[PDB]
Amino acid sequence: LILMNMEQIERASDKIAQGVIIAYRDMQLERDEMYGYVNIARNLDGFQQI
Amino acid sequence: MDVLYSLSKTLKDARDKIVEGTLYSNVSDLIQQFNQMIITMNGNEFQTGGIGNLPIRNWNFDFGLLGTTLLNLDANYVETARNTIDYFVDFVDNVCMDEMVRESQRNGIAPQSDSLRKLSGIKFKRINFDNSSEYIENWNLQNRRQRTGFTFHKPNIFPYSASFTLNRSQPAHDNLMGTMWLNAGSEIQVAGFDYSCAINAPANIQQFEHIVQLRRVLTTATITLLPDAERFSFPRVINSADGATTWYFNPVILRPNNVEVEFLLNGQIINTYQARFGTIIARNFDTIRLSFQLMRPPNMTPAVAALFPNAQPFEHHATVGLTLRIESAVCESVLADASKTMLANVTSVRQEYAIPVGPVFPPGMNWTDLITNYSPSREDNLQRVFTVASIRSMLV
Amino acid sequence: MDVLYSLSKTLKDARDKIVEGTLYSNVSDLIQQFNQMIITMNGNEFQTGGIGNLPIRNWNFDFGLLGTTLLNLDANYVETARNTIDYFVDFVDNVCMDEMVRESQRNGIAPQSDSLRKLSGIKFKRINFDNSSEYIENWNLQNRRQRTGFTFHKPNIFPYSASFTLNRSQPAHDNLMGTMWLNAGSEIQVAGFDYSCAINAPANIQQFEHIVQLRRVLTTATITLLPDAERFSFPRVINSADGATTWYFNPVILRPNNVEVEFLLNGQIINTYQARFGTIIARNFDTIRLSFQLMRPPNMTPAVAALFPNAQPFEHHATVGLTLRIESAVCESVLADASKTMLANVTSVRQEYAIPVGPVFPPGMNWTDLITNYSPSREDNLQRVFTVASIRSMLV
Amino acid sequence: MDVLYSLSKTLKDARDKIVEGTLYSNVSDLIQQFNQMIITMNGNEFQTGGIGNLPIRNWNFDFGLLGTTLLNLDANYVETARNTIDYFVDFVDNVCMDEMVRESQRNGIAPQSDSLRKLSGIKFKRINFDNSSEYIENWNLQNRRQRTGFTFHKPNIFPYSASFTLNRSQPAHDNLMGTMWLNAGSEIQVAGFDYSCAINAPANIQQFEHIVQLRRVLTTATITLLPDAERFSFPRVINSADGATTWYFNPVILRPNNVEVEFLLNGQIINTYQARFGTIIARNFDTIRLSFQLMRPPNMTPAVAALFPNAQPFEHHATVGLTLRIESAVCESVLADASKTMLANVTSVRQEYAIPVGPVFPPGMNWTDLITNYSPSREDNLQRVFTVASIRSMLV
Amino acid sequence: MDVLYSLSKTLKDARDKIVEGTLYSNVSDLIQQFNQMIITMNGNEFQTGGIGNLPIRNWNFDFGLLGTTLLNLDANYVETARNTIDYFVDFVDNVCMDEMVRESQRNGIAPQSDSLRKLSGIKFKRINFDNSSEYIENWNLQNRRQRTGFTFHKPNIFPYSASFTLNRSQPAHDNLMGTMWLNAGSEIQVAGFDYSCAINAPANIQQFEHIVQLRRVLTTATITLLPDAERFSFPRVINSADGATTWYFNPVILRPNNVEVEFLLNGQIINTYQARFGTIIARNFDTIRLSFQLMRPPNMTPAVAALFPNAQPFEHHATVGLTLRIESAVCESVLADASKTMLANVTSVRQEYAIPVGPVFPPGMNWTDLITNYSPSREDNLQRVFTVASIRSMLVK
Amino acid sequence: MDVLYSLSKTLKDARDKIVEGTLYSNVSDLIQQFNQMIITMNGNEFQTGGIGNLPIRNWNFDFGLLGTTLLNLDANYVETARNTIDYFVDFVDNVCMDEMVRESQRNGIAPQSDSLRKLSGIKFKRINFDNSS
Ligand SMILES: [Cl-]
Ligand SMILES: [Cl-]
Ligand SMILES: [Zn+2]
Ligand SMILES: [Zn+2]
Ligand SMILES: [Zn+2]
Ligand SMILES: [Zn+2]
Ligand SMILES: [Zn+2]
């Protein structure tokens, strides 16, 4: 139970993020109901992961 | 292929085991594997192709996990599981169909559809679990360069061929010596005929030989050997080699003499059976040699002696036949047989969606042409599609 | 039915897995399922009925649970398990026998015996676990109106019929044109005969047609086609249609001409095969149409020309054959086949206990009568009894 | 035998389930069983093969346990497991081969090879786990003397025998009355012939009887019965009983009359079918009694009346036939059949290593000789070797 | 196989690089590999050879490690290393010989000798290091089932066959039309002969065809095609097909006409070369079709016209040749070729110790029989023994 | 050409030497060269083909470095390395094929394909190592 719900519990935390994409192109800030404008990535597709 | 099989097996086990009232301990590992599959597939977009009349289909996966905290499964659990199982089964069936209708010459064993190539990526290796079916087991063993075999009941190893050879003939076709045969599927019927009944033959014996060269090696083969060929035991009107005219065959069946059935591998005799009929075992062979003799009966009752005069006209033609039926065998390669539906499934899927003729298989997946020219590329593509068909059979 | 199957599966798993010295980890889930079955069945009284000569049997369940506190199973554990397993196996066998000998016109799919009706109560659904057999899979699918599938090796789809049709006849029966066939099991042998050898036919062609209507739709069928029919290739004395007289048949086999095998679904040609014999695939069909022509050979050697005069008397009769064998197929309905034993088991149980003939099945469970008039009620009752037979065959 | 089967089953499970990326929950129980096997086998020396050309192989077991700590299996785990599995699979195959090539007249059911004798000790009984295969299941049931069952598709129960009986004959063989039959494998083709066509027979009926005594009792048997025996329906020149001459047989096939097929157990009629053709069920029998009749057609057309004169010479000989195929059956003893490969495996292993003829089996494992004299000692040895062969086929 | 190859490679590197006076920095990694080998082999017992006249050899490994404190290698260090290397090389030679003389019908690619079976354990996998030889590289690719490639100079792809076909003949053998060929090794010499010189032919053209089916597919093949076949260009007395009599062949060579070389794969034309002589490339093929015409020269000088009369007797017979030499090729399977010695080594070892005829290979390692019936099991066994032979050649040779 | 040769030889040495169970000291220098190649190639976009029936192929490099082991390489290391090695081998084969099918009357010795022209830039000279063939 804990193992299968780990990722959901972790992503619910308000004090840690799951990563940061450094893309040296200008990307529009997403429009999110929780923030307004926010530089939030929904996934990491299209980037090398370290 | 292992990931596709694992998806299919997970879905089959979910259908079989996720049933109302069952103890969760009966399905705990299955639910763990199912949730692993969901997690691995979530967030991935798949496309099953538009080859032929097969429609382009897009697949998304954003499913939640199944519960793991009941003592016994209830109706809500089964309905919730079924909702996901239906979508996954549809996706697997479409991926299998897309892979079944494609072929390649350079690399026919590798996946051909984009969905199966995507599933061969490392990120999906987590879905992989028990590979127990015969076809997937053979696939994994062969990827390991390990000796593996498919077991066939009545293997379809002989391309269809009804033909004859006239070792003695004439334009009027009234004094003929030769052989007639049908090699069809797992069956060989051969018959040597002499119109003169070896009246002018050395020792009054006429020798007939029939060699059948199998396109693949067979091992641990159980074979029925019977001393007569009923297919060539009644009057027939038969075209000539060029079709210019038709000749007449009026057999009178005699016991074949000095019957020797040799099963050979690389030209060396592996098994030899002399005057043995019934069940015989050919342990490892690629060629069958049937030698038999028409022996003129030294003593004949008047009714018999009437049939075989000293000279022409010959109205009754002496024939000796053999029948060889391969009941069961083992092959390194894949073959059509009387028990398995792989060839039928592949042909049906190709026919239903009007798949054009490719560069590998003959039109219509015709088995006679396929087995006649069983090239390595054909073997690779055929094993790939047969494995995919077996995977599809688990769900469809 | 699912609860009865689950009882049988649990007992089979207990027989196979509960062995001396085995790790308890090998049986933990099986032991839990077994103890759950014991708890569910404990305190219940069953009666397997006295229909026919089947004896009335009373069943009481007061059994202790199997232990869960060993590292490896020992002889004590195996004996304690085996006593209970023997009693439960006897009970399951008797319940299956009680259900197999029963039928109804209204709800033949529903349980008929009192014991199986009792097992269909909710208080037994806890016993239900893995439904992995083909028959139980199809039972669960059909209970949900889902696409079912049974794979048959040599399906017994054709009711036995050795018949003939004379399209040209007269009291002398010396100039006959027509067809004779044997449709038995998975095999159709047909032969069209012309006594005149199409001397007066237009273009010297005689056309023969044989339509066989299957009582159920077959899918993904692999079929062997052979040019000649050996069953109608020897001289016979055949009774007349009324049985008043006997006529004489003296075939001489010519190869069939313009062979067309059509596999049709609702009168629509799904598959067509022209002049192809070796091995063919019919993906979905319920009717087989075999068209074949006797063509008088334009060029004949003196013997062949002797066979076929310009007018009567006709002593040699030109015959063109055709053999069609369904090696394997898929059907949405249960069928008898050469590999399974369900029909044999049901018939044996009904014969051994002198079960009186019922409203649904023909006397003696005769398969020809059953498949000739395969009604929906007959299908439901047959599926029920065949599923029960498969359940019983897991333990007996 | 149970320990050898458990070794083979554990290795098959390891090969099929220990795959890269698989959840450890999919293998946890299997890993426990595998580690138990390693612990049990470690420190033991085995020797296999000193008979025929089977090489002497020495086996030492010093292997580490598999890990229990991963969440998903990775490459390292699979490589270690694969190395251990390869060694163990080779050992099991060699032990099976060593056991298959040995026989004993006294205790042929007991292990013959020293390796299997060592494995029968208590110190190896821990390896034993799930015994689900039909052959090992029957082995265990036989050890306890419970009722065994082997299901055979086309059981090979009739030793090959093509012979005839002449109830009426004379030196010229022009007026013969008798029967000729082929009892081969799973088929009985029997034809009764009368050269006079029952012209002088009382009521113009000639009675023919054929009794086939099965060497073992068959139960739940599905039988195809067809009116005609095509094998004896064509002109044939047949040796005399002493071989001093040959006689002529020119059959004209009349349908058999008053066909009665009885299936007998201990001389009592268990089943009886009168003029029933197609699929029939024989639930328990050891003898087949086919009684049929040639009835002279009371009404004949001019051609038919021309076939059968009032006295000699008789140029056309009236023949009635019967074909009987056992599609499927159940036997309490092991038998060769079309679908399995046990006989083929044992014969191939004995032929490959040139095993000298022993005191139990016929040379070459001739099945006709084996089933002709199916003694209890032969039955014990054959069940032993067939079970070992089924164990070996799980891996090899 | 990889462990045996790694043993041989380590030993060869030690023999080549552990030399007096060399910097320790030249051999540090090699010394570590050698000591790893010593540690892995120490305390293990091996037995090699109980087949034919090959003696039973028992091998024990109890060796000290080579030192690592030197900055340059001195004589004593090299001598001790040489003693250890000599023992190890003897062991590796014997293991290779034991493996080369064995064959299996089932798993011919798997180890057959018990020493190599023991070396196939996990504990010995530590010995594995650089696998750079062509044969071991192909072995590792084949284990993973990647596209293998063996480069052969003059591949021995054609089994020996000197035969002829008569399309026109009669018992006097004075008016013959046909072809005679020798397919031997990497060479095909074919020659079509017409005794009448196509006097009565349809437009004075006689077409000849020769089909050669390769038992394995060849890729990237350099092939020399020469117009004439010197092998069938001199007077010959040739047995009849039945051997009942002998006939006479007095050829006069005319240049072949409309020469067409067709290189086909699975009965599909891959390469076609028309009237092209010299070096040609066949990129991927398994069948060669050589079609060539004898064209009667319309204009003849008096001597040429005297050679070919209008009718019989025909004293001079018109012949057109073709020579095809595969200089180099690539095959996914092992083959005998001119440059390598793998087949020679395997046959030499098998003959040296009187290895009895096995169930796989022909009765004596005859290459014509092997390539004639080059079955998958034979291919596996041949690849195994050839890889072992190449491993042995690194040390014994 | 020297850079393309160095890529090919680095890949050949990686295939031959990065084998399960080998001492990390047997590959240390090779691993350093391979990681230098990965660093230099990562983030670069290459295109091959577009001539005849040679397909247009796009190559992107976003690989991580090969790690280290204390004593001996294991199976996990070999598979992880082999994924990258396979991609690089495919890229090198495609670049070689693109270069083999092109020719120039002027400067026939100079690179003709765009991929090889890019590989002749200064940034890739880092990859260059032993030119021994
Ligand atoms: Cl069958
Ligand atoms: Cl040279
Ligand atoms: Zn002819
Ligand atoms: Zn009538
Ligand atoms: Zn069958
Ligand atoms: Zn007699
Ligand atoms: Zn000649």
Curated annotation (Swiss-Prot), chains B, C, D:
InterPro entries: Capsid_hemagglutn, Rotavirus_A/C_VP6, Virus_capsid_a-hlx_vir. Keywords: Calcium, Capsid protein, Intermediate capsid protein, Metal-binding, Ubl conjugation, Virion, Zinc. The keyword Nucleotidyltransferase does not apply. GO terms for biological process: fusion of virus membrane with host plasma membrane. The N-terminus is blocked. One of its GO terms (cellular component) is viral envelope. The keyword Transferase does not apply. Zn(2+) binds at residue 153. It holds the Pfam family Rota_Capsid_VP6. Residues 62-73 are annotated as: Interaction with the inner capsid protein VP2. It is found in: Virion. Ca(2+) binds at residues 266, 286. GO terms for molecular function: host cell surface receptor binding; metal ion binding; structural molecule activity. The VP6 trimer contains a zinc ion located at the center of the molecule. The zinc ion is not essential for either trimerization or transcription activity of the DLP. Zinc-depleted VP6 has an increased sensitivity to proteases. Intermediate capsid protein that self assembles to form an icosahedral capsid with a T=13 symmetry, which consists of 230 trimers of VP6, with channels at each of its five-fold vertices. This capsid constitutes the middle concentric layer of the viral mature particle. The innermost VP2 capsid and the intermediate VP6 capsid remain intact following cell entry to protect the dsRNA from degradation and to prevent unfavorable antiviral responses in the host cell during all the replication cycle of the virus. Homotrimer. Interacts with the inner capsid protein VP2. Interacts with the outer capsid glycoprotein VP7. Interacts with the outer capsid protein VP5*. Belongs to the rotavirus VP6 family. This is Intermediate capsid protein VP6. It comes from Rotavirus A (strain RVA/Monkey/United States/RRV/1975/G3P5B[3]).
